[PDB]
C-alpha cells in the first residue's frame, strides 16, 4: 500500500516499511540479511548528511563567486587558499586524519558494542555517548535541541524528511560534478546560461552528453 517506487510491483521480503523512505527499492536484494541491512542504513544516513553539507557549501561559495566578492570556485578554493596562507599540506592532512579517526572509530565500536561508549570510560561522561538507535545518537549533545525526546510522531516525520533531503543532496552533488566536468565551467553559471536559452543551452547541445 505504501507508494512503491515501481507502481504496480509488490515489495520484496526484507523491505517492509519500518524504516524511513521504504519505497520498496532494493531490486538487487542487497538487504536480505538484517545485519547488512542495518549496516547499509547507517551508511546511507552518513552519506546523505555529507551530501547535504557538500551541496550547501558548494552553492554558497558559488553565489559568493558570481557576486563580486572574490570567492573562488569550489574546485580551486583548496589550492588557492592553501597557497594564499602559510599552510602545509602534510600538517593539515595529518591533523585532519587524527581527529576524524578518533571520532569515527568511536562511532565504529559503538555500532559493534551498542552500549559501551557511555560507560564512563570517557572523561566522566554517560547518557550522551550512549546510542539511541542504529545511527541516531541523539543525546544531550548530538540532539542538544532535544527534539528526539519529544513528539515521536514529529520525530518520525523528521527522520523521513532527513533521508529524503539526503538522497536529493547526493544526486545534486553528482549533478554538480558532471556539470563542471562537462562544461568546464561554474555550476551557477551553467544555470544562468540554460536560463538564458533552455531551448539551446542544454546537454542536447553540449555535444558531449549526447555524443552525436
Amino acid at each position: 500500500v505504501r507508494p512503491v517506487w515501481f507502481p504496480g510491483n509488490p515489495p520484496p521480503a526484507h523491505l517492509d516499511g519500518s524504516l524511513a523512505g521504504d519505497y520498496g527499492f532494493d531490486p538487487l536484494f542487497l538487504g536480505q540479511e538484517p545485519q547488512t541491512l542495518k549496516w547499509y542504513v547507517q551508511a546511507e544516513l552518513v552519506h546523505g548528511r555529507f551530501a547535504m553539507l557538500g551541496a550547501a557549501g558548494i552553492i554558497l561559495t558559488s553565489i559568493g563567486a558570481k557576486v563580486g566578492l572574490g570567492f573562488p570556485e569550489w574546485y580551486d578554493a583548496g589550492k588557492v587558499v592553501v597557497e594564499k596562507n602559510n599552510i602545509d599540506f602534510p600538517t593539515l592532512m595529518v591533523i585532519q586524519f587524527y581527529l576524524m579517526g578518533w571520532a569515527e572509530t568511536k562511532r565504529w565500536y559503538d555500532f559493534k558494542n551498542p552500549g559501551s561508549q557511555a560507560d564512563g570510560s570517557f572523561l566522566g561522561f554517560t547518557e550522551e555517548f550512549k546510542g539511541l538507535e542504529n545511527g541516531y545518537p541523539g543525546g544531550r549533545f548530538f540532539d542538544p535541541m532535544g527534539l528526539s525526546r519529544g513528539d515521536a510522531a514529529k520525530y518520525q516525520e523528521y527522520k523521513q524528511k532527513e533521508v529524503k533531503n539526503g538522497r536529493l543532496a547526493m544526486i545534486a552533488c553528482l549533478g554538480f560534478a558532471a556539470q563542471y566536468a562537462a562544461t568546464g565551467k561554474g555550476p551557477l553559471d551553467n544555470l544562468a546560461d540554460h536560463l538564458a536559452d533552455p531551448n539551446h543551452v542544454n546537454f542536447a547541445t553540449n555535444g558531449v552528453s549526447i555524443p552525436i
Partner: protein, 229 residues
Amino acid sequence: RPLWLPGSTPPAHLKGDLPGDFGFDPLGLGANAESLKWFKESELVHSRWAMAAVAGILVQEIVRPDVFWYNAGKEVESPLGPLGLLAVEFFLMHWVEVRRWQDLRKPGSVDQDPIFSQYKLPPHEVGYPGGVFAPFIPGDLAELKVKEIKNGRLAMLAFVGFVMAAQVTGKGPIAALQEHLADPWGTTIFSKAAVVPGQAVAPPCKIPASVSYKGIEIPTPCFLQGLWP
C-alpha cells in the same frame, strides 16, 4: 484565548501557563521540559537586552547626533585605557552572569548576601528575582510580565531593523525615517532592489570596509552582503 493565528489550534505542550503565550511553536520546539525552561529564560534575557539597547540607541542619536551609533566603537575617546575598560567589564559581568547561572542550575541556592548575611533575597522563580530588584510596582505582576515580553520581542525586532537599515543606508534611523516620510514611494527596498530571472540587483553596502583603530585595523565585513535582495 488569543492565538497568533485566529481560527487555528495550539500545539500540545503549549498550554497557556506562561505569560504572553499565544501558542506559537509551529515547530514544536517546546517539547521537553528542561529545554523549555532554558528557552523561556533565554527569551527573557534577550528581551530585556534588546529593550535596553533600542532605548539607548534612540536617545543617544537624539541627544548627541552626528556621532554614528554604529560607530561609537571607534569614535569613542576615553582617558581610561581600553584594556582597562574591557578588563573591568569582563570581570564584573563574568561575576554577575555566573551567579545567575549558579542560580538556574541550583535554584534558590545563593539568595543570601554572602557578606551582609543580614541582607538576603527572598525565594522566587527563575527570571524573576524581585525583592530589592522589584522595590516599586504599580499594578499587577500578571500584566507586567505580559508587557515585559511584548516590549522585549518588539525591541528585538526594532534592533535588527536598525541593523539592516544601517547596513543599507548607513544613516541614523531617525534620519532614515525622515527620508521615508519625505518619499513614500522611493524609500522602499522594492524601489531599492529586486530579483528577476533576467538579473539581480542589490543596493550597495554603506559601511566601507576594515576600519583602523590604534593599529588593530579591525576587519569589518557586512552581514552576508551576498544575499541582500
